[PDB]
Amino acid sequence: QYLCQPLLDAVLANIRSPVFNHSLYRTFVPAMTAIHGPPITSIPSVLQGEVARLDPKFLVNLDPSHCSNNGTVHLICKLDDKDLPSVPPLELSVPADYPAQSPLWIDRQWQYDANPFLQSVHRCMTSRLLQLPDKHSVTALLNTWAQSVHQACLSAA
Amino acid sequence: AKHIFLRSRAAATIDSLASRIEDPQIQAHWSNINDVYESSVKVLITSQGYEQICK
Amino acid sequence: VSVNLEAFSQAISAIQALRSSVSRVFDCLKDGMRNKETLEGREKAFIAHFQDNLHSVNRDLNELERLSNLVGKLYSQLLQAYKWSNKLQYHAGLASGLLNQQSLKRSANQMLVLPPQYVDDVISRIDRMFPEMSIHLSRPNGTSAMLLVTLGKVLKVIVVMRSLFIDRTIVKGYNENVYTEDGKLDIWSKSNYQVFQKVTDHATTALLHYQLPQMPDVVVRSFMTWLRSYIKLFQAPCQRCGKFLQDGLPPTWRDFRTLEAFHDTCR
Amino acid sequence: MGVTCVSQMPVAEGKSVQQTVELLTRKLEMLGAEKQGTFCVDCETYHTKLMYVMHNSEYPLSCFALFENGPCLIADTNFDVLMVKLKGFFQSAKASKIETRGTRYQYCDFLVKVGTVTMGPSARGISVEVEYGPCVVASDCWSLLLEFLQSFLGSHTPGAPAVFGNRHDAVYGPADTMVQYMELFNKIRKQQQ
Amino acid sequence: NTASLCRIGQETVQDIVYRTMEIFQLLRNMQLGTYQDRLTKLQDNLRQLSVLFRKLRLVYDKCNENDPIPVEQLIPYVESEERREIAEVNKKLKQKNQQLKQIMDQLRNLIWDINAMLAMRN
Amino acid sequence: AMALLLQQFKENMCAFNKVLAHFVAMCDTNMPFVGLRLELSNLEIPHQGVQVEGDGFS
Amino acid sequence: METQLQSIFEEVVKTEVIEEAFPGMFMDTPEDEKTKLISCLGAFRQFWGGLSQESHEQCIQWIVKFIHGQHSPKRISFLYDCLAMAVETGLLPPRLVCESLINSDTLEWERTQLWALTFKLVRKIIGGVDYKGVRDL
Numbered sequence: 001q002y003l004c005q006p007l008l009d010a011v012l013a014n015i016r017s018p019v020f021n022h023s024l025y026r027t028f029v030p031a032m033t034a035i036h037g038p039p040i041t042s043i044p045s046v047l048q049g050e051v052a053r054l055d056p057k058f059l060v061n062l063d064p065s066h067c068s069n070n071g072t073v074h075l076i077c078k079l080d081d082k083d084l085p086s087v088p089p090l091e092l093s094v095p096a097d098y099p100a101q102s103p104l105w106i107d108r109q110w111q112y113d114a115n116p117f118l119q120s121v122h123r124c125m126t127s128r129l130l131q132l133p134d135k136h137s138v139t140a141l142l143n144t145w146a147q148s149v150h151q152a153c154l155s156a157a
Numbered sequence: 158a159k160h161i162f163l164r165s166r167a168a169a170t171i172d173s174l175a176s177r178i179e180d181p182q183i184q185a186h187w188s189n190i191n192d193v194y195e196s197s198v199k200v201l202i203t204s205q206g207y208e209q210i211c212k
Numbered sequence: 213v214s215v216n217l218e219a220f221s222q223a224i225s226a227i228q229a230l231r232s233s234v235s236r237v238f239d240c241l242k243d244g245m246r247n248k249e250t251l252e253g254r255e256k257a258f259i260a261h262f263q264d265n266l267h268s269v270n271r272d273l274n275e276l277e278r279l280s281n282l283v284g285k286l287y288s289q290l291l292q293a294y295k296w297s298n299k300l301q302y303h304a305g306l307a308s309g310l311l312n313q314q315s316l317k318r319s320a321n322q323m324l325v326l327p328p329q330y331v332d333d334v335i336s337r338i339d340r341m342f343p344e345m346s347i348h349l350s351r352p353n354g355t356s357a358m359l360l361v362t363l364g365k366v367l368k369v370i371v372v373m374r375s376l377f378i379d380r381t382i383v384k385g386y387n388e389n390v391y392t393e394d395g396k397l398d399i400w401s402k403s404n405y406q407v408f409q410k411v412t413d414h415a416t417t418a419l420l421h422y423q424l425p426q427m428p429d430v431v432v433r434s435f436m437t438w439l440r441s442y443i444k445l446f447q448a449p450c451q452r453c454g455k456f457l458q459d460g461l462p463p464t465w466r467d468f469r470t471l472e473a474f475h476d477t478c479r
Numbered sequence: 480m481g482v483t484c485v486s487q488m489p490v491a492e493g494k495s496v497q498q499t500v501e502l503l504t505r506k507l508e509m510l511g512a513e514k515q516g517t518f519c520v521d522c523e524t525y526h527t528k529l530m531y532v533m534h535n536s537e538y539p540l541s542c543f544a545l546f547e548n549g550p551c552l553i554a555d556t557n558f559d560v561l562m563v564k565l566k567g568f569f570q571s572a573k574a575s576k577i578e579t580r581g582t583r584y585q586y587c588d589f590l591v592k593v594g595t596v597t598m599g600p601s602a603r604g605i606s607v608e609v610e611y612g613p614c615v616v617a618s619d620c621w622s623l624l625l626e627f628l629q630s631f632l633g634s635h636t637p638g639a640p641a642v643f644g645n646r647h648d649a650v651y652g653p654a655d656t657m658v659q660y661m662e663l664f665n666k667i668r669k670q671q672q
Numbered sequence: 673n674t675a676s677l678c679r680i681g682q683e684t685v686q687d688i689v690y691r692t693m694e695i696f697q698l699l700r701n702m703q704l705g706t707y708q709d710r711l712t713k714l715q716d717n718l719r720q721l722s723v724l725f726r727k728l729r730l731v732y733d734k735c736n737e738n739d740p741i742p743v744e745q746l747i748p749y750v751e752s753e754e755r756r757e758i759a760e761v762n763k764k765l766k767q768k769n770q771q772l773k774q775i776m777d778q779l780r781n782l783i784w785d786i787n788a789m790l791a792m793r794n
Numbered sequence: 795a796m797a798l799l800l801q802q803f804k805e806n807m808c809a810f811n812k813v814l815a816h817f818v819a820m821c822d823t824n825m826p827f828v829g830l831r832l833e834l835s836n837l838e839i840p841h842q843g844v845q846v847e848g849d850g851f852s
Numbered sequence: 853m854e855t856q857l858q859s860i861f862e863e864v865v866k867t868e869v870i871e872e873a874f875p876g877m878f879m880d881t882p883e884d885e886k887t888k889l890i891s892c893l894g895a896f897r898q899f900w901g902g903l904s905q906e907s908h909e910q911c912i913q914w915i916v917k918f919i920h921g922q923h924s925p926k927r928i929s930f931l932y933d934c935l936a937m938a939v940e941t942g943l944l945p946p947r948l949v950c951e952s953l954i955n956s957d958t959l960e961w962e963r964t965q966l967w968a969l970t971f972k973l974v975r976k977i978i979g980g981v982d983y984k985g986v987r988d989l
């Protein structure tokens with residue numbers, strides 16, 4: 001500001017002119033040249049990474065059915081835990097632009113029915129997924145599945 | 158009499174520990190000035206060949 | 213005083229910055245108008261870039277003037293020696309500071325007795341500095357050393373050392389009686405105050421902390437330096453909870469190598 | 480021996496002395512203080528200038544002799560007997576006996592004493608004493624005392640007793656508390672109501 | 673005879689590091705009678721450091737020639753008369769240690785008794 | 795002060811009371827992660843749920 | 853007039869912030885829809901009992917703005933269930949709710965899950981509307 005108002009006034013009163021560059025060059029090239037001399041001489045990566053960094057209790061892979069190589073992918077899950085029994089596969093669908101959103105779980109009510117243990121698992125599952133917050137990931141849901149199975153097994157015996 | 162008894166048992170437990178387990182070393186040094194009511198020790202746990210590093 | 217050297221160096225840096233800023237201003241204005249894709253950004257970018265250089269020039273001139281207000285009032289081969297000597301002490305000074313931290317030794321072994329005058333002169337050499345500290349030595353019993361250290365109008369410390377190795381410490385206030393009925397030093401007693409008991413525990417931890425393997429003088433020097441910080445007690449608050457009192461106790465913990473007050477609960 | 484502050488708490492525009500006293504004691508017990516006994520402070524004036532003779536239950540083997548601006552003696556309990564011997568040069572100045580009574584609380588090296596002041600049978604004031612233990616230098620610890628007083632009093636907090644005004648490195652002693660008590664007693668005997 | 677050589681080479685490595693640190697410290701302690709004494713001490717330390725470097729080189733040259741079996745192979749995961757002679761030395765040493773225990777507990781009791789009796793002679 | 799919530803933990807020589815020590819241990823060790831989770835959410839970074847990694851201890 | 857309703861249906865979709873930390877800690881098990889819906893429909897019934905003739909529509913308008921304002925689609929599905937047995941009992945006419953749902957400007961084809969769920973719900977309650985309402989729909 002101070003000591004430089006005339007330059008600001010000159011620049012503002014000169015701007016958006018077709019010959020501004022020519023004027024500036026012709027008025028300021030020679031002294032600068034003389035004083036100093038010459039001038040200077042499919043599947044998104046996030047899903048692949050999160051699958052790579054999951055606990056070896058899970059071996060999730062692509063669904064043999066449904067579409068592929070798109071923004072929305074489908075995965076089928078299997079649980080291999082020595083301390084827990086076998087449960088339905090609990091497949092998932094991943095929408096496009098997975099970060100900053102949440103995946104959804106495809107419920108299969110008839111699969112979990114006809115057994116008190118399996119429907120106890122299912123009601124604990126519904127409770128936990130209602131307890132999960134927004135913007136959650138798939139690893140959190142898988143861990144919730146494992147913990148719900150463990151809690152149901154503990155409650156049974 | 159009480160203080161004498163208590164001191165002798167503390168010494169015996171430290172020494173039995175030193176003689177029974179050898180995974181970490183244990184070492185004690187007693188003081189040199191002493192009273193009729195109090196006493197002191199310094200106890201120090203170190204590995205057999207690493208006394209300079211892990212102390 | 214050595215502040216003039218730093219002031220002169222800052223003035224040199226300021227004038228170099230001023231010259232560079234003027235050159236930058238004129239070169240940037242000579243460069244001209246750029247493209248910047250769309251028209252609207254092209255208009256704003258040039259003005260924004262032009263204002264900043266002038267503002268920097270004004271700021272540099274203002275700070276240079278602030279410094280100006282702040283400032284005030286065979287031989288060659290000799291100088292070549294001098295400018296070498298101060299180049300050595302600093303060069304080793306860093307090298308000794310970086311090798312002691314990363315000690316690679318594993319054990320002292322491969323594959324104590326001192327004259328009383330040595331200890332007396334070492335303790336006197338400690339006593340000559342720190343004018344507030346006053347140290348008195350005695351040997352009522354054998355060769356063991358009993359030292360009474362008085363600090364200001366606040367602290368009285370009794371230290372029993374076994375052949376220059378510090379062994380036991382008990383601290384008390386100012387008005388409390390430190391001598392026995394016979395007149396000798398009272399070794400086995402308590403301070404009858406919670407804060408003084410807590411700082412006795414702190415002193416025990418400190419003496420258990422400072423442990424060099426083959427330099428014993430630096431150990432007592434560090435202990436005395438740490439004990440020096442306690443004179444400022446009751447006037448300095450904790451660095452975490454702000455207030456002086458926590459459960460009725462003032463800050464009684466002085467961190468090692470960074471001597472600042474702290475409450476015991478604040479770690 | 481430690482630094483001591485003596486002040487007067489106003490009656491708070493209503494109620495009686497006992498209600499204010501029980502409110503203060505309830506606050507103290509809520510903070511975490513505990514009872515450890517009782518205390519009493521008395522004073523008498525003598526004249527042929529004025530002399531003051533005081534006793535304190537905290538120091539059970541002492542008598543304090545005070546002037547308005549002169550020196551101060553700390554004698555043993557026999558001193559009053561000497562006054563009884565004079566009886567011809569210093570009258571007792573009857574109707575000038577005043578006492579403060581109450582109980583003392585201790586909370587982690589602090590001593591708090593809240594008492595009632597009586598002109599004999601009639602009580603007309605409240606006195607508050609706070610004493611710190613480990614510090615002997617006057618004004619060195621003045622911040623801790625201010626913080627504690629603001630802790631259990633809020634408003635009505637005093638500040639900077641006039642005895643501290645000798646801005647040196649002097650050691651605070653038990654004779655200064657008696658000066659503060661004498662000033663407080665003079666203020667109460669002046670205001671009345 | 674070769675494991676001892678490896679341990680000696682290791683130890684000489686730590687001594688080399690310690691001597692370098694001591695050299696830098698000694699250069700720091702020099703402040704412009706005794707200056708010749710410090711200079712001779714510096715020369716002695718540098719020459720013994722050079723001897724230590726030579727010894728380390730000799731040890732490395734000796735141990736380099738005498739790997740067929742790689743690392744990470746001998747780590748165990750989840751999935752003749754020497755012993756006879758060694759035992760006697762262990763038992764004998766253990767017996768000696770036990771004897772030292774009796775002397776030590778006895779001397780400490782003696783010092784405790786003299787401390788207790790002398791503390792209150794006044 | 796106030797009060798904001800209350801939860802009861804599941805019920806499931808001999809003078810040590812090992813369960814209370816274990817609860818204090820895990821609570822102090824694990825509560826630091828809650829603030830960092832909440833802050834990584836608050837500044838809009840996509841994270842995963844706080845989880846035990848590899849071995850059970852960390 | 854809406855604060856009480858917002859509170860009730862905020863307790864419907866209540867989210868505990870401290871959760872997802874210390875799993876398997878609270879002894880209590882969260883209530884299922886069989887349990888959760890009965891209580892919610894009773895609360896919404898007592899709210900509906902105290903409303904006037906001219907004020908019936910506006911609150912419902914507000915609530916659809918609340919249902920589509922959530923971000924987790926399954927929570928929106930149980931909110932749809934709340935409305936489904938709200939209209940089934942005759943407490944709410946199954947003509948105001950349909951027009952309130954469809955007329956919402958928050959619903960476009962961009963939101964796939966909302967589209968599918970809302971149109972299935974509209975298909976569920978279409979059988980009890982007079983033919984004029986069907987023509988408008």
Ligand SMILES: [Zn+2]
Nearest residue numbers: 450453475478
């Ligand atoms: Zn603190």
